[PDB]
């Protein structure tokens, strides 16, 4: 069976991982102890996808944690589901990078990446058929980015035939967290694009508006935003673990989504959300889901498609549905809103359907998009970058770790190039 | 873990450290005798953390701090005070005499035979660290010991350890209020050195906190026993990220790399939400949206510095209590929304954020009332150069006639050393102009 | 100088392999014009090139040796090099089409590369004067599985001595290799020794299509600087020019159906085909650019293209040589090659000479 190694790196990722497994465990009938108490073999037929088994009919996840520079270590362990994780997979060091990428790539992570890599090799070897890797992190920060791309590259050299996926919280346009995100990320993107099969670009701001308006929540937290990220992470791989009329898998997602090897950044979405009240005020249909799916406000990436166009998408549905209504609905979208789509791709969309709905929903769906709108985020990071670079605004902190101007320069040329590539196809022809 | 050392040099810091450790112990349920009847009752919790406090086998806890001021009549208060059975008795009262507003005694003459032990007991403290380190040195500028000594210490420390963050919470000299005539001499001579060794010298004034204490706290007749607490809370608001959990916690190094564009401009400010009295403890919501406006109000600045005469380079905010991140994002946006607040072109990012859950505590005998949330702000701006201007000018007049100098020479400091700092501080001011000016193409 | 690329072609004849398994002729040279007969005898494709040679036979006019081909194709680039222009020549085509046999050739009939090299050394001998001082250097490296390795290094002693390098992009002069051990040339003899070492250590191997295949991509760089007098009464020898020559031996498709193989073999073949595809896309967008089209060029989609950016385009007087077979067994391959070439003529770059009057005032006076 297909097997995945999930990795956690950075304050933002580990919590996403933390919220993640809490969902998967619920999708597989597992308790905080790791025992089975479900009611369906389906929750077990493919448990080896994400988990290993242990002696007394317990089930250990294939999770790894690498930036547990300890401050978040206890936070994970002393949690409602901290205890299931393999204690040996709790890898860490100390003296956090202070968001300095170089410390997170060249000095400290250098010392630690061996050990985490060694553990990965174990989880790899214990597999029967390894498919790909699943990393959670964020750009803009030191650990999630630098140590990430480091660990990503090495793994790629060891398993270049295999798949490497990420779900990376991206820096915002407006509301920053750190002040050197243009520095921290562009370096990351330089190594991210070149050592990746795909990545899922997520922005906090969109998630806020998403939870603010559609979910109509006035007091959302980092704990709840993630709860949406974990959903998509699970929907992408629903057709992996569960059956359906039309099956999908990670490899089948890329090849239909990645026309050119460098345009492998995506804008996900997920349905359906209704703030509990309106639940009594609708009904779940395929056109209904589709309607939210291509909603310009359900895009967690914050790159308004309507100033750009789509290359290719993947609309993974989940539940009991009829395929006629499915295939019809995509065509309608291709028809009416054709200008947002490419001519030289004759069909700009694929599909996938799994016959197993989630815990308390009759039908669900997951969105995946590849579009030209991603240019905008990329310009921002570039424009922010240069304004600081030319004055060497904060540069001296990295040079103290051994970086040089060329490296910052290199990534810039690369990032601008990615933009131009998208801009090539941005104009209708 | 993470460790952090508290050093108090002179009187001004020591008097503060009394305020600090009082809050720390209280905030962590620790008793003055180092005991934990709260842990006895609970039977759990790592509260008595290695961030600030060591622990023995007896359940007693001991703070990671030393101090020295070359004035026994102060430290002895602690050796007799209620916290005497807290601290390690290897606190360095070598005060045969005081520096007496003379830099040179603390640096050259009687800085000898004292600093040898300061470093020693420090080494002993570091040897107990199985984790991060970072230094909190509390002094006052313009003073005879709070400078001439603290110049040595940071220099030696940049050698023994070097690759550690060296932070300072320090009293700047006011424009008007002075308790001496030699603050300008004593101050400028200091900056010649700590500019090179340190990495972030958080500054405060007494004039500002005085006026603050009148307006918002409704306090007519303050003293050090009310000022220090505010200065203590700020230090906590920083360091609380280390001891407690939070959605967006921060270390000490994180500040260093975000606030400090160029090595030599590491001179930021601070504010808070001490807008609180038992009476006005009501009638307000104390939202995230209110305080953030306040944290850029000229009045609630803790030094006598008009931001509006300069621009912001970079800023960091640290919230406590029941705080919602989304609300922060709206609020920060509002702060950019306002046009009075001019940032450098350099930093559309501009801001950092950190958040903790653990709200502030209150000290009985105190004034600042209870709340559900609070924030600390830090800021690096250009406006301070004007304050640096004041000191260079004050210096200029009473140096020209070489007033008071025979004293400093009387301890062996050469004439030209004064000018050396001056050329430096002028150049430093010039740096603020270069950077403050907008970029071009 | 917005100017085009010289595209040349060489139909090699058939072999023992065809003798054993009969494979008819279908490529035909009307002196120089290329014509290919479909084995179905339903179509004749034909292609026109700036240059042709008919090595299918020694007798009919159009025939040319290595050095005839040189003085047709590469000596002009020698000329532009001494004029100061960066220059390029690169090969293309399938396995067993003599792509090395042309560029590098063997001991007994060495290729355009060694012919040009001795011509270059003696051409410096023609002007070995104090009028202009000359300084020549060269590097030589290989591409295998997107990994860059140094041909001029004596490997150490270990089970794995294929030390990888990496690429870096100077903001001005463009890409280059770290640790690339560019060495000084005294003469063509030194060039020869260097080339011998490199071609020996090249990761090449026997297979079912040829006894020895170029399974890695090879780059051979020379750079000649020439410091000349300026037109001033003061320091006269303050003018200099540089010229960068780039000679490239690529790999062939090696379709696995005939190149039945496994493991590392198929891996190298995959990487090769991927590289060549990327190159083809580069070439095509370049042609479209030469047609005036505003187009994004995926130089960065691999290493070969990235390094050869300034040669595939940029600023250099350049050429390509395409190798093709007569056997109908590989007519599809030869057609693809010919179409690659006939498209390739359409490409232009903007070629000047590298004085590098940096900190000189000479270009400013000019
Ligand atoms: C339980 C119930 O009958 O009420 C619904 C409910 O009110 C609604 C609004 C739920 C609810 O969603 C939220 O309340 C929510 C709040 C903050 C952030 C994110 C979600 C629900 O929590 C979400 C929950 O969905 C699930 O149970 C799935 O397991 C979902 N994840 C979880 O909710 C979950 C989290 C922790 C532990 C166990 C389950 C999921 C998502 C992706 C992949 C698999 C499963 C459901 C049906 C509901 C509640 C519980 C109210 C909705 O979400 C889902 C997945 O159903 C929000 O819009 C849908 C429509 C549902 O009707
Ligand atoms: N904010 C604050 N400032 C203080 C306190 N105690 C003293 N100071 C300041 O310290 C300065 C006096 O010089 P100090 O540096 O304290 O003198 P010292 O540190 O005892 O060393 P000497 O200069 O030798 O006395 C004045 O500017 C006071 O405002 C205090 O409790 N709070
Ligand atoms: N036109 C020709 N006339 C005479 N001999 C030739 C001709 N072309 C090739 N040969 C010889 O036949 C052999 C086949 O060429 P070969 O060198 O295998 O092609 P290649 O350049 O190696 N292709 P690759 O290995 O994919 O780079 C060579 O060793 C040449 O000596
Ligand atoms: N969605 C989400 N994002 C978070 C969370 N915590 C932090 N982040 C984001 O992650 C970024 C912090 O980067 P981080 O990975 O902590 O830096 P590093 O760990 O030092 O590399 C900030 O931009 C935060 O907005 C969380 O719980 N959920
Ligand atoms: Mg004193
Ligand atoms: Mg060859």
């Amino acid at each position: 069976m297909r097997e995945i190694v999930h990795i956690q790196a950075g304050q933002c990722g580990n919590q996403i991982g933390a919220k993640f497994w809490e969902v998967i465990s619920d999708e597989h009938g597992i308790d905080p102890t790791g025992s089975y108490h479900g009611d369906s073999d389906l929750q077990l037929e493919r448990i080896n996808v994400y988990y290993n088994e242990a002696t007394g009919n317990k089930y250990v996840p294939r999770a790894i944690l690498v930036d547990l520079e300890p401050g978040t270590m206890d936070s994970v362990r002393s949690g409602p589901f901290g205890q299931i994780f393999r204690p040996d997979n709790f890898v860490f060091g100390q003296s956090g990078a202070g968001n300095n990428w170089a410390k997170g790539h060249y000095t400290e992570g250098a010392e630690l990446v061996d050990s985490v890599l060694d553990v990965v090799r174990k989880e790899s070897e214990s597999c029967d058929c390894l498919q790909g890797f699943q990393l959670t992190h964020s750009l803009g920060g030191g650990t999630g980015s630098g140590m990430g791309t480091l660990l990503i590259s090495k793994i790629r050299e060891e398993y270049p035939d295999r798949i490497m996926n990420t779900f990376s919280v991206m820096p915002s346009p407006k509301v920053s967290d750190t002040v050197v995100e243009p520095y921290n990320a562009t370096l990351s993107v330089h190594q991210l694009v070149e050592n990746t099969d795909e990545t899922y670009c997520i922005d906090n701001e969109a998630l806020y508006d998403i939870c603010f308006r559609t979910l109509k929540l006035t007091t959302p937290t980092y704990g709840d935003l993630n709860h949406l990220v974990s959903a998509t992470m699970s929907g992408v791989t629903t057709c992996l673990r569960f059956p359906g009329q039309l099956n999908a898998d990670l490899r089948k997602l890329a090849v239909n989504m990645v026309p050119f090897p460098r345009l492998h950044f995506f804008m996900p979405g997920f349905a359906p959300l209704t703030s509990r009240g309106s639940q009594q005020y609708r009904a779940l249909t395929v056109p209904e889901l589709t309607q939210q799916m291509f909603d310009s406000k359900n895009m967690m990436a914050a790159c308004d498609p309507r100033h750009g166009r789509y290359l290719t998408v993947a609309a993974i549905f989940r539940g009991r549905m009829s395929m006629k209504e499915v295939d019809e609905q995509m065509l309608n979208v291709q028809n009416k809103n054709s200008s947002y789509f490419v001519e030289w791709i004759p069909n700009n969309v694929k599909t996938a359907v799994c016959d197993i709905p989630p815990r308390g929903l009759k039908m669900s769906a997951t969105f995946i998009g590849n579009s030209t709108a991603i240019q905008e985020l990329f310009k921002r990071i570039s424009e922010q970058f240069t304004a600081m670079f030319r004055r060497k605004a904060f540069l001296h902190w990295y040079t103290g770790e051994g970086m040089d101007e060329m490296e910052f320069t290199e990534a810039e040329s690369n990032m601008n190039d990615l933009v131009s590539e998208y801009q090539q196809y941005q104009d209708a022809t | 873990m993470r460790e952090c050392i508290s050093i108090h040099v002179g009187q001004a810091g020591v008097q503060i450290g009394n305020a600090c450790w009082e809050l720390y112990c209280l905030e962590h349920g620790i008793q003055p005798d180092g005991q934990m009847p709260s842990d006895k009752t609970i039977g759990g919790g790592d509260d008595s953390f290695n961030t600030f406090f060591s622990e023995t086998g007896a359940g007693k806890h001991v703070p990671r701090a030393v101090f020295v001021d070359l004035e026994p009549t102060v430290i002895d208060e602690v050796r007799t005070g209620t916290y005497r059975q807290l601290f390690h008795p290897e606190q360095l009262i070598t005060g045969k005499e005081d520096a007496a507003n003379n830099y040179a005694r603390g640096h050259y003459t009687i800085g000898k035979e004292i600093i040898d032990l300061v470093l020693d007991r420090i080494r002993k403290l570091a040897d107990q660290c199985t984790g991060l380190q970072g230094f909190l040195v509390f002094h006052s500028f313009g003073g005879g010991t709070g400078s001439g000594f603290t110049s040595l210490l940071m220099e030696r420390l940049s050698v023994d350890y070097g690759k550690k963050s060296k932070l300072e919470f320090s009293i700047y000299p006011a424009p008007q209020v002075s308790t001496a005539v030699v603050e300008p001499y004593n101050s400028i001579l200091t900056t010649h050195t700590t500019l090179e060794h340190s990495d972030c010298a958080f500054m405060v004034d007494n004039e500002a906190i005085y006026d603050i204490c009148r307006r918002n706290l409704d306090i007519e007749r303050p003293t050090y026993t009310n000022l220090n607490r505010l200065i203590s809370q700020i230090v906590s608001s920083i360091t609380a990220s280390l001891r407690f959990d939070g959605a967006l916690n921060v270390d000490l190094t994180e500040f260093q790399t975000n606030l400090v564009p160029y090595p030599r401009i590491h001179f930021p400010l601070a504010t808070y939400a001490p807008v609180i009295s038992a009476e006005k403890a009501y009638h307000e919501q104390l939202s995230v949206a209110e305080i953030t406006n306040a944290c850029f109000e000229p009045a609630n600045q803790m030094v006598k510095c008009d931001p509006r005469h300069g621009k912001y380079m970079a800023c960091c905010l640290l919230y406590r209590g029941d705080v919602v991140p989304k609300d922060v994002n709206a609020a920060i946006a509002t702060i950019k929304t306002k046009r009075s607040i001019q940032f450098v072109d350099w930093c559309p990012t501009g801001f950092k954020v950190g958040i903790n859950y653990q709200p502030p505590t209150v000290v009985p005998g105190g004034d600042l009332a209870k709340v559900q949330r609070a924030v600390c702000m830090l800021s690096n701006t250009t406006a301070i150069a004007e304050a640096w201007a004041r000191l260079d000018h004050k210096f200029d007049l009473m140096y020209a006639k070489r007033a008071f100098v025979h004293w400093y020479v009387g301890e062996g400091m050469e004439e030209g050393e004064f000018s050396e700092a001056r050329e430096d501080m002028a150049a430093l001011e010039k740096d603020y102009e270069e950077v403050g000016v907008d970029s071009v193409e | 100088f917005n100017s085009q690329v010289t595209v040349a072609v060489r139909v090699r004849p058939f072999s023992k392999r065809e003798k054993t398994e009969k494979a008819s002729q279908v490529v035909f040279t009307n002196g120089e014009e290329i014509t290919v007969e479909h084995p179905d005898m339903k179509q004749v494709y034909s292609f026109i090139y700036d240059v042709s040679f008919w090595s299918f036979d020694e007798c009919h006019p159009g025939y040319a040796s290595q050095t005839t081909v040189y003085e047709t194709l590469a000596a002009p680039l020698l000329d532009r090099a001494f004029e100061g222009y960066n220059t390029c020549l690169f090969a293309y085509g399938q396995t067993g089409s003599g792509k090395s046999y042309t560029m590098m050739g063997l001991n007994e009939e060495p290729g355009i590369i060694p012919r040009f090299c001795e011509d270059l050394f003696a051409q410096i001998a023609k002007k070995q004067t104090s009028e202009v001082s000359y300084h020549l250097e060269m590097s030589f490296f290989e591409v295998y599985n997107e990994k860059i390795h140094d041909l001029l290094v004596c490997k150490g002693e270990n089970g794995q001595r294929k030390q990888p390098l990496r690429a870096r992009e100077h903001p001005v002069s463009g890409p280059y290799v770290e640790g690339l051990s560019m060495n000084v040339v005294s003469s063509y003899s030194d060039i020869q020794s260097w080339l011998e070492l490199g071609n020996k250590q090249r990761a090449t191997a026997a297979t079912g299509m040829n006894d020895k295949s170029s399974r890695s991509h090879s780059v051979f760089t020379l750079v000649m600087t020439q410091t000349k007098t300026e037109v001033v009464e003061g320091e006269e020898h303050d003018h200099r020019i540089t010229s960068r020559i780039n000679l490239v031996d690529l790999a062939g498709s090696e379709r696995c159906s005939t190149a039945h193989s496994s493991g590392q073999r198929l891996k190298e073949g995959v990487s090769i085909n991927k590289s060549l595809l990327t190159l083809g896309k580069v070439i095509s967008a370049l042609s479209e650019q030469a047609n005036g089209k505003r187009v994004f060029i995926p130089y960065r989609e691999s290493t070969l293209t990235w390094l050869l950016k300034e040669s595939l385009g940029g600023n250099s007087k350049t050429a390509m040589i395409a190798t093709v077979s007569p056997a109908a067994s590989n007519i599809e391959e030869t057609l693809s090659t010919l179409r690659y070439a006939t498209q390739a003529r359409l490409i232009v770059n903007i070629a000047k000479v590298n004085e590098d009057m940096n900190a000189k005032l000479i270009r400013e006076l000019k």
Side-chain angles (χ1 to χ4, degrees), chain C residues 91 94-102 104 202 210 212-216 249-252 323:
Chain C
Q94 289 86 321
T95 267
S97 38
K99 88 179 43 119
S100 31
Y101 143 104
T102 42
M104 195 67 74
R202 182 179 200 170
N210 66 12
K212 284 304 337 210
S213 234
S214 335
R215 318 239 127 246
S216 150
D249 167 25
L250 302 193
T323 65

Side-chain angles (χ1 to χ4, degrees), chain A residues 19-27 81 211 214-215 217 220-221 223-235 238 241 270-277 279 284 292 318 357-362 364-366:
Chain A
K19 179 59 63 167
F20 170 82
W21 295 99
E22 288 184 354
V23 144
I24 297 294
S25 305
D26 174 56
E27 227 184 58
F81 286 82
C211 73
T214 293
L215 290 185
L217 312 200
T221 183
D224 296 24
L225 274 64
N226 295 339
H227 174 302
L228 315 162
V229 167
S230 155
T232 293
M233 291 167 74
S234 140
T238 293
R241 302 165 273 150
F270 171 97
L273 338 162
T274 25
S275 303
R276 319 195 169 202
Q279 199 24 108
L284 303 194
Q292 282 183 35
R318 210 185 123 141
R359 199 41 149 222
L361 302 173
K362 306 296 185 175
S364 52
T366 298

Side-chain angles (χ1 to χ4, degrees), chain B residues 92-115:
Chain B
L92 182 70
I93 312 102
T94 52
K96 312 151 190 178
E97 324 86 340
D98 197 20
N101 292 302
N102 185 319
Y103 181 104
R105 276 157 80 101
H107 199 298
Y108 310 107
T109 312
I110 55 176
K112 301 163 162 77
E113 308 99 14
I114 302 180
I115 195 72

Side-chain angles (χ1 to χ4, degrees), chain B residues 270-346:
Chain B
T271 71
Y272 191 72
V275 200
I276 320 298
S277 56
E279 288 73 348
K280 293 172 192 179
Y282 311 77
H283 305 256
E284 302 188 4
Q285 296 81 347
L286 315 188
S287 64
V288 176
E290 287 158 321
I291 65 191
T292 302
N293 300 311
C295 281
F296 287 88
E297 161 50 42
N300 300 316
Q301 299 301 305
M302 298 288 287
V303 313
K304 300 286 277 178
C305 183
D306 199 320
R308 308 176 284 190
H309 308 171
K311 305 174 185 172
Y312 287 66
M313 290 290 166
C315 52
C316 177
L317 281 91
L318 307 164
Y319 295 72
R320 296 180 60 163
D322 174 29
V323 186
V324 170
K326 170 258 290 179
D327 285 346
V328 177
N329 295 336
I332 296 297
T334 315
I335 291 291
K336 281 186 197 175
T337 307
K338 291 186 176 175
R339 305 281 71 76
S340 69
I341 300 172
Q342 185 60 88
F343 287 91
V344 73
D345 52 341
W346 298 351

Side-chain angles (χ1 to χ4, degrees), chain A residues 246-258 293-294 311-317 326-327 330 334 341 345 347-353 366-368:
Chain A
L246 208 170
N247 305 126
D249 210 332
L250 301 169
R251 212 180 262 286
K252 249 160 113 64
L253 291 173
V255 165
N256 289 279
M257 289 287 287
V258 178
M293 275 196 92
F294 297 89
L311 296 159
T312 180
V313 311
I316 302 158
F317 293 70
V326 167
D327 302 339
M330 300 297 114
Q334 302 266 303
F341 291 70
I345 286 158
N347 182 315
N348 283 294
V349 52
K350 82 191 305 315
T351 45
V353 180
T366 298
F367 180 91
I368 313 187

